[PDB]
């Protein structure tokens, strides 16, 4: 299946990503467009440590949830058409070959009707 969030152009929108096992001493994350960023979370849209956002590509991207409890959902401010598409949430997990990758598609419309 695919999880799609539908929103009207220009309206802030939140794409869910929750990791309930989150431990601030162990986990961190990043979001990417189209596919997940590579391990290390470079070229990411937005990136955290175990507690808070540590870098982002622009102020369009915010994490408004409680990051130390694993709510690393992405909020996109004033989305325009180019912002539509697949977003991938990568959770960095201790060890090798253990990272979690969660995909959400953003669909933007002019109306909900």
UniProtKB/Swiss-Prot annotation:
Ig-like V-type domain sequence ranges: 2-103
Location in the cell: Cell membrane; Secreted, Extracellular exosome
Domain of life of the organism encoding this protein: Eukaryota
Disulfide partners: 17-89, 30-41, 36-88
Annotated function: Phosphatidylserine receptor that plays different role in immune response including phagocytosis of apoptotic cells and T-cell regulation. Controls T-cell activation in a bimodal fashion, decreasing the activation of naive T-cells by inducing cell cycle arrest, while increasing proliferation of activated T-cells by activating AKT1 and ERK1/2 phosphorylations and subsequent signaling pathways. Also plays a role in efferocytosis which is the process by which apoptotic cells are removed by phagocytic cells.
Domain notes: Recognizes phosphatidyl serine via its immunoglobulin domain.
Quaternary structure and interacting proteins, as annotated: Interacts with MERTK; this interaction enhances TIMD4-mediated efferocytosis. Interacts with EPHA2.
Family per record: Belongs to the immunoglobulin superfamily. TIM family.
Annotated protein name in UniProt: T-cell immunoglobulin and mucin domain-containing protein 4
């Amino acid at each position: 299946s695919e999880t799609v969030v539908t929103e009207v152009l220009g309206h802030r929108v939140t794409l869910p990503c929750l990791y309930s096992s989150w431990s601030h001493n162990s986990n961190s994350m990043c979001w990417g467009k189209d596919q997940c960023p590579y391990s290390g979370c470079k070229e990411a849209l937005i990136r955290t440590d175990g507690m808070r956002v540590t870098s982002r590509k622009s102020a369009k991207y915010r994490l408004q949830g409680t990051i130390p409890r694993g709510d690393v959902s992405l909020t996109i401010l004033n989305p325009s058409e180019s912002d539509s598409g697949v977003y991938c949430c990568r959770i960095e997990v201790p060890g090798w070959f253990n990272d979690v990758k969660i995909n959400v598609r953003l669909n933007l419309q002019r109306a909900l009707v």
